Design a protein around this ligand. Structure first.
Ligand code: AGS
Ligand code: AGS
Lengths: 727, 189
């Protein structure tokens, strides 16, 4: 008999003896493959390149058939975390002598700082089979150094992960350096650490405590008269760093790790999926300091009140409950789960005694994004060129909605942009030499829209504020809501007020409401969602309200956002209430959501309507849409600006068409009519001659004689009465 | 409480009362009760007034002084089906009208707390009377708008001043007197 994939454990000694590069193994494993004690053999994770080590027979009286025990030196090379499955194999080739080698420290010093070379020689002779990555730590210190470590940083591949060598004193030119990593050109795996996670400092502290105490100080807790926590539940929106924390916990917690990532346990055969959970938990008890990760727990522990849950899933939930309760004697196993939708987990698993402890991973704020970007950019400091922390703080300020995955994508796209630009100067430029100037991160932001916004497909032609002629008070009041609350948060805080977060734009048809919406989308800088009501309505009961909840949820997933309710009056029910069963629920849901964002959040709601007084008073009160602005017909200057914007590509100067006279003639026009006048003039010019160069006053006369004034005294009176409905 | 599938709304209401049985004394709060009984009883009585049926059944089962009481709110009083206002059900009514001069001044004092109104000479007793007919939230809004007027003038503000309150006042509009002070005076009768 010969197991397929053996389990890693430590060889109990950590004195850095002669064994530091041996692999204690059960006799049958060596013999069945005809390996012998002292012979070299390969160890590696399933499907990866191998790691060379020295085989050695263990104590069959105690040592199980399935266990291969390695050294902290060997495990450093491949980042073998206690409990991963190894695909051991025999080896047939002897590596040469390490002609050139270097040794350093993970903590950044030179080994020339504390200890003489003799103990270094002895230690690296105990290694024997030299290769990069053999960290070893906790030696004696010649000085009173608070800590120490040593690492073989480089040396000079038969499906091997590291390039192995053999020690031969003197011939192997061993130098010494400040280096902490191993040579990247080898691409040995690198362990993650809590120093890479940024922004989540407090969550990290809580999780570190909750994992430190149960595994490594259980006896202490029990004296306080309560049983220890035994389940932790990480949750939050996708892309915030849960799985990263799970892998960092695996690397940093010196405990045996078992994983159930998704439905990796389900089986064809009727009973065997339960056997999988029971086996995992039994093996976690075998090596009592251990952690079991259940990532994407909702995929295997569904709610069962959601009747979509199958029999397999109910049987899995029942077994997992009886196991979690059955972690008897208050041992040292800790079960950490991660889920982006914790409410889909069966409540039986969140009861006290089950996953009672929960850590919420929130969306980064500006400071959190600054921390994440500083950490991510500190990994590339020699190629950075955005070295100013001011520049990184600018990028953090501009990246509204980025969640932590999006920031890493931003850095990746910045690398790509820098390569594109550099390679644009020479087809064979040294691509490794290019460095990431801020301009390239700014260019990358154009492509990397937040992942929370990928369900918002909108064409959105590009329109700037300068295109919206002569609405200056509207522009100022939109600044006040879109930019000032973000650039002046501290002044609001000290004054003790929240900025208004709703505005209603009303006015005659043609005046720039939707144009202001497009301008906000183009130049607000923050995320933009639009609901073209009555787009939300749906046949089935509850679907119309679920649409409002979903759009407000995505606006809440975007962090700073702008929900533009075009024709909001379509959602406000009718006066007579005739068959408005669905509409009433729609308006109540909309009000409940505007009240949900009313507290603690900074979403801004913009609404545009042509019938200002047919929308419910509950939806116009402050807290709901606060500000009302009358987007009225352009005055003389506004029409002059529109005429310039339109006729700029006409040769007006030589043509002699004086735009001021047009502005005088066009009194009463809406902006749409002023634009149509220019379009009609251009059509007249083109129809007169297909090779037009100039549009001249006869064409504008022709266009003018055909354009009506859609605005009437009645409409203007109505919109100037809406401001006075109170009396 | 409303779901696409058949009968899931009824189950939800009965389950809400079931869970409500858990304690006493206890207030059940039906905000915007007018959107629980909007129609299908007075009109459009086709097949889907079950939610009203269930709620109006439950409202009777609760004992008169066992410990549970029920509070509701509405700004559309006549949209509430008369079935709910039958005595024994919900017949008691309290009017929450626009604040009087002294109430508005208390709101102003609270929401202008960190404004140095004393140093700037912003005499609240002028704002409290100028803001007559301002219904609650609008008194609060007038103070947010004053602050924004202050910040836009010179970011890094120390205090807000009367001219900012003038700018705020000139931009706020009130409610409808043929709908407010009416349709509630009538509902009082
Ligand atoms: N501070 C950080 N927060 C989050 N992600 C970070 C951070 N720093 C770097 N990252 C990277 O962002 C990604 C985070 O991993 P994810 O798997 O996206 O975490 P998660 O998406 O929140 O968990 P899921 O969606 O349930 S698998 C990885 O590619 C990390 O390298
Ligand atoms: N300064 C401006 N003021 C008004 N309209 C302008 C201005 N500049 C351009 N336009 C034109 O305005 C048109 C669109 O105006 P909209 O904002 O969509 O009007 P509207 O408010 O949506 O009217 P409704 O929705 O029917 S009540 C486009 O054809 C623009 O070319």
């Amino acid at each position: 008999k010969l197991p397929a994939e053996f389990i890693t454990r430590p060889h109990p000694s950590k004195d850095h003896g002669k064994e530091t590069c041996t692999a204690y193994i059960h006799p049958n494993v060596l013999s069945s493959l005809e390996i012998n004690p002292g012979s070299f053999c390969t160890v590696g994770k399933i499907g990866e390149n191998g790691i060379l080590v020295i085989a050695r027979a263990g104590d069959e009286e105690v040592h199980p058939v399935n266990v291969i025990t390695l050294s902290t030196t060997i495990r450093s090379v491949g980042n073998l975390i206690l409990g991963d499955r190894l695909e051991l194999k025999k080896a047939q080739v002897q590596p040469p002598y390490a002609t050139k080698v270097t040794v350093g420290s993970l903590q950044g010093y030179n080994i020339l700082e504390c200890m003489e070379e003799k103990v270094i020689q002895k230690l690296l002779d105990d290694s024997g089979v030299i290769m990069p990555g053999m960290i070893f730590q906790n030696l004696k210190t010649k000085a009173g150094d608070e800590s120490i470590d040593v690492v073989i940083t480089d040396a000079s591949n038969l499906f091997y992960l590291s390039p192995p060598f053999i020690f031969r004193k003197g011939s192997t030119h061993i130098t010494f350096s400040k280096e902490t990593q191993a040579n990247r050109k080898y691409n040995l795996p690198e362990p993650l650490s809590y120093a890479a996670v940024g922004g989540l400092d407090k969550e990290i502290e809580s999780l570190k405590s909750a994992i430190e105490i149960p595994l490594h100080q259980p006896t202490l807790f029990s004296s306080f008269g309560v049983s220890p926590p035994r389940g932790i539940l990480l949750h939050g929106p996708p892309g915030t760093g849960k799985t990263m924390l799970l892998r960092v916990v695996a690397n940093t917690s010196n405990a045996h790790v078992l994983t159930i990532n998704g439905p990796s346990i389900v089986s064809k055969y009727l009973g065997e999926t339960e056997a999988a959970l029971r086996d995992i938990f039994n093996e976690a008890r075998k090596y009592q300091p251990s952690i079991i990760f259940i990532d994407e727990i909702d995929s295997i522990a569904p709610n069962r009140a959601n009747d979509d849950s199958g029999e397999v899933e109910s049987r899995v939930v029942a077994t997992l409950l009886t196991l979690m309760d059955g972690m008897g004697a208050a041992g040292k196993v800790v079960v950490i789960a991660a889920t982006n939708r914790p409410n889909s987990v069966d409540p039986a698993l969140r009861r006290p005694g089950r996953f009672d402890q929960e850590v919420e991973i929130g969306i980064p704020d500006v400071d959190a994004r600054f921390d994440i970007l500083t950490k991510q950019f500190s990994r590339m400091s020699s190629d950075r060129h955005v070295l100013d922390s001011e520049a990184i703080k600018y990028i953090a300020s501009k990246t509204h909605g980025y969640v932590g995955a999006d920031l890493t994508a931003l850095c990746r796209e910045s690398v790509m942009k820098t390569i594109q630009r550099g390679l644009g100067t020479d087809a064979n430029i040294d691509k490794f030499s290019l460095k990431v100037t801020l301009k390239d991160v700014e260019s990358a932001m154009v492509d990397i829209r937040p992942s929370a916004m990928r369900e918002i497909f909108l064409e959105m032609p590009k329109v700037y504020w300068s295109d919206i002629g002569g609405q200056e008070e509207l522009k100022t009041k939109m600044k006040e809501m879109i930019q000032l609350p973000l650039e002046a948060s501290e002044t609001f805080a000290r004054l003790g007020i929240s900025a208004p977060k709703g505005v209603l734009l009303y006015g005659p048809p043609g005046c720039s409401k939707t144009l202001t919406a497009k301008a906000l989308a183009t130049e607000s800088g923050i995320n933009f969602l639009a609901v073209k009501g009555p787009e939300i309505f749906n046949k089935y009961v509850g679907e119309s309200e679920r649409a409002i909840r979903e759009i407000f949820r995505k606006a809440r997933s975007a962090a700073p956002s702008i929900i533009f309710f075009d024709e909001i009056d379509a959602l406000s029910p009718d006066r007579d209430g005739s068959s408005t069963s669905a509409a009433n629920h729609v308006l109540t849901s909309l009000l409940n959501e505007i009240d949900g964002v009313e507290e603690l959040k900074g979403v801004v709601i913009v609404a545009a309507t042509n019938r200002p007084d047919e929308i419910d008073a509950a939806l116009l009160r402050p807290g709901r849409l606060d500000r009302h602005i009358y987007v009225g017909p352009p005055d003389v200057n506004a029409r002059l600006e529109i005429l310039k914007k339109c006729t700029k590509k006409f040769n007006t100067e030589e043509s002699g068409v004086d735009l001021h006279e047009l502005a005088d003639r066009t009194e009463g026009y809406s902006g749409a009519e002023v634009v149509l006048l220019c379009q009609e003039a251009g059509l007249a010019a083109i129809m007169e001659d297909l090779d037009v160069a100039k549009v001249e006053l006869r064409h504008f006369e022709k266009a003018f004689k055909g354009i009506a004034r859609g605005i009437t005294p009645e409409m203007l009176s109505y919109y100037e009465e809406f401001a006075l409905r109170s009396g």
